[PDB]
Design an enzyme around this catalytic site. Structure first.
Site, PDB file in Angstrom:
ATOM      1  N   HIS A  85      -4.795 -13.798   2.490  1.00  0.00           N
ATOM      2  CA  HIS A  85      -6.148 -14.054   2.951  1.00  0.00           C
ATOM      3  C   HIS A  85      -7.082 -14.054   1.755  1.00  0.00           C
ATOM      4  O   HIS A  85      -6.623 -13.935   0.605  1.00  0.00           O
ATOM      5  CB  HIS A  85      -6.637 -13.125   4.077  1.00  0.00           C
ATOM      6  CG  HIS A  85      -6.753 -11.682   3.753  1.00  0.00           C
ATOM      7  ND1 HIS A  85      -5.687 -10.807   3.708  1.00  0.00           N
ATOM      8  CD2 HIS A  85      -7.851 -10.925   3.520  1.00  0.00           C
ATOM      9  CE1 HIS A  85      -6.148  -9.575   3.441  1.00  0.00           C
ATOM     10  NE2 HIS A  85      -7.453  -9.619   3.314  1.00  0.00           N
ATOM     11  N   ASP A 128      -8.171  -8.259  -2.956  1.00  0.00           N
ATOM     12  CA  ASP A 128      -6.846  -7.637  -3.021  1.00  0.00           C
ATOM     13  C   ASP A 128      -5.704  -8.611  -2.847  1.00  0.00           C
ATOM     14  O   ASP A 128      -4.541  -8.261  -3.016  1.00  0.00           O
ATOM     15  CB  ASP A 128      -6.714  -6.396  -2.117  1.00  0.00           C
ATOM     16  CG  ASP A 128      -7.043  -6.639  -0.657  1.00  0.00           C
ATOM     17  OD1 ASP A 128      -7.796  -7.538  -0.309  1.00  0.00           O
ATOM     18  OD2 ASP A 128      -6.545  -5.833   0.126  1.00  0.00           O
TER      19      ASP A 128
HETATM   20  O1  9NW Z   1     -12.329   0.333   4.041  1.00  0.00           O
HETATM   21  S1  9NW Z   1     -10.980   0.299   4.192  1.00  0.00           S
HETATM   22  O2  9NW Z   1     -10.633   1.670   4.623  1.00  0.00           O
HETATM   23  N1  9NW Z   1     -10.582  -0.799   5.331  1.00  0.00           N
HETATM   24  C1  9NW Z   1     -10.833  -2.234   5.110  1.00  0.00           C
HETATM   25  C2  9NW Z   1      -9.545  -2.878   4.681  1.00  0.00           C
HETATM   26  N2  9NW Z   1      -8.460  -2.962   5.445  1.00  0.00           N
HETATM   27  N3  9NW Z   1      -7.525  -3.639   4.750  1.00  0.00           N
HETATM   28  N4  9NW Z   1      -8.014  -4.024   3.572  1.00  0.00           N
HETATM   29  C3  9NW Z   1      -9.263  -3.558   3.461  1.00  0.00           C
HETATM   30  C4  9NW Z   1     -10.128  -3.713   2.236  1.00  0.00           C
HETATM   31  N5  9NW Z   1     -10.646  -5.075   2.034  1.00  0.00           N
HETATM   32  C5  9NW Z   1     -11.337  -5.309   0.818  1.00  0.00           C
HETATM   33  C6  9NW Z   1     -12.395  -6.251   0.843  1.00  0.00           C
HETATM   34  C7  9NW Z   1     -13.077  -6.545  -0.333  1.00  0.00           C
HETATM   35  C8  9NW Z   1     -12.407  -6.366  -1.552  1.00  0.00           C
HETATM   36  C9  9NW Z   1     -11.281  -5.505  -1.589  1.00  0.00           C
HETATM   37  C10 9NW Z   1     -10.588  -5.188  -0.398  1.00  0.00           C
HETATM   38  C11 9NW Z   1     -10.086  -0.103   2.736  1.00  0.00           C
HETATM   39  C12 9NW Z   1     -10.834  -0.479   1.675  1.00  0.00           C
HETATM   40  C13 9NW Z   1     -10.225  -0.888   0.441  1.00  0.00           C
HETATM   41 CL1  9NW Z   1     -11.392  -1.368  -0.702  1.00  0.00          CL
HETATM   42  C14 9NW Z   1      -8.807  -1.068   0.179  1.00  0.00           C
HETATM   43  C15 9NW Z   1      -8.128  -0.548   1.318  1.00  0.00           C
HETATM   44  C16 9NW Z   1      -8.704  -0.143   2.559  1.00  0.00           C
HETATM   45 CL2  9NW Z   1      -7.590   0.280   3.823  1.00  0.00          CL
HETATM   46  O    OH Z   2      -8.396  -6.600   2.172  1.00  0.00           O
HETATM   47 ZN    ZN Z   3      -8.702  -8.016   3.403  1.00  0.00          ZN
HETATM   48 ZN    ZN Z   4      -6.789  -5.209   2.293  1.00  0.00          ZN
END
Ligand code: 9NW
Ligand code: OH
Ligand code: ZN
Ligand code: ZN
Length: 230
Positions: free
Chosen positions: A83, A87
């Site tokens: 996507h 990340d």
């Molecule tokens: O806030 S979160 O707890 N949940 C949202 C979330 N779920 N899956 N991936 C994500 C993060 N998505 C982002 C979007 C912008 C750039 C980097 C990554 C989280 C936050 C982080 Cl930055 C990396 C892990 C988790 Cl698990």
């Molecule tokens: O993400």
């Molecule tokens: Zn994401």
């Molecule tokens: Zn993610």
């Protein structure tokens, strides 16, 4: 044995053997005042390697390539980003400079551009509608429908029964969604139902962040997402 967030300095990458010719890659990155782990996949593609997702940034993705060379020793020739978030695409420019042909769906490429992220070079055709699947070398790419993001793909490795769920699938210990900005919480359970119907023989299920599990992660994720919805 699976490496955890506090064990991987930001800028280092671990590889974890899942099955013959299948690895996860694990990296860490700082975001919004915390450090998080993140997974991708590596699949042997004959005499070459297929990469699923970057290691969440240019420096990390360079370290990924170095670890691959040191530990595996075959060239990465293609990459798919599942996507548009950083990340998944952050580091595509390093991949391209290293000789890797980078791919994503047309929607992912557009979303990444608007977000100000790096943009995979090539568009994957045949993935625009929920339930669409295409073969890509040693894997099947599947668009289950909107979930964590509108564009999220999952990846199945039929020879190994490995399902890479990416950020649409949560690790078992994770009990909250965290940020839901770009997610489609109403659609997510139905997207997961599609995955379960399409891949009932999966043995290993790899989330976008955290520890591998099995098909139990699908119901678990649905539970967490529904709980947030309320
Ligand atoms: O806030 S979160 O707890 N949940 C949202 C979330 N779920 N899956 N991936 C994500 C993060 N998505 C982002 C979007 C912008 C750039 C980097 C990554 C989280 C936050 C982080 Cl930055 C990396 C892990 C988790 Cl698990
Ligand atoms: O993400
Ligand atoms: Zn994401
Ligand atoms: Zn993610």
């Amino acid at each position: 044995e699976y490496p955890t967030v506090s064990e991987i300095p930001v800028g280092e990458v671990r590889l974890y053997q899942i099955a013959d010719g299948v690895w996860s890659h694990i990296a860490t990155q700082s975001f919004d005042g915390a450090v998080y782990p993140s997974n991708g996949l590596i699949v042997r593609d004959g005499d070459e390697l297929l990469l699923i997702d970057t290691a969440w940034g240019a420096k990390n993705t360079a370290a990924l390539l170095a670890e691959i060379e040191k530990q595996i020793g075959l060239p990465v020739t293609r990459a798919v980003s599942t996507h548009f978030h950083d990340d998944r695409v952050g580091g595509v420019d390093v991949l391209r400079a290293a000789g890797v042909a980078t791919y994503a769906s047309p929607s992912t490429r557009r979303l990444a551009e608007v977000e100000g992220n790096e943009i995979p070079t090539h568009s994957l055709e045949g993935l625009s509608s929920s339930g669409d699947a295409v073969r890509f070398g040693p894997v099947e790419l599947f668009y289950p429908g909107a979930a964590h993001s509108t564009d999220n793909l999952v990846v199945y490795v039929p020879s190994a029964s490995v399902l890479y769920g990416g950020c649409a699938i949560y690790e078992l210990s994770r009990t909250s969604a965290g940020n839901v900005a770009d997610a489609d919480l109403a659609e997510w359970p139905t997207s997961i139902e599609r995955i379960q119907q399409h891949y009932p023989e999966a043995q290993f299920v790899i989330p976008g962040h955290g520890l591998p599990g099995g098909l139990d992660l699908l119901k678990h994720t649905t539970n967490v997402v529904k709980a947030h919805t309320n």
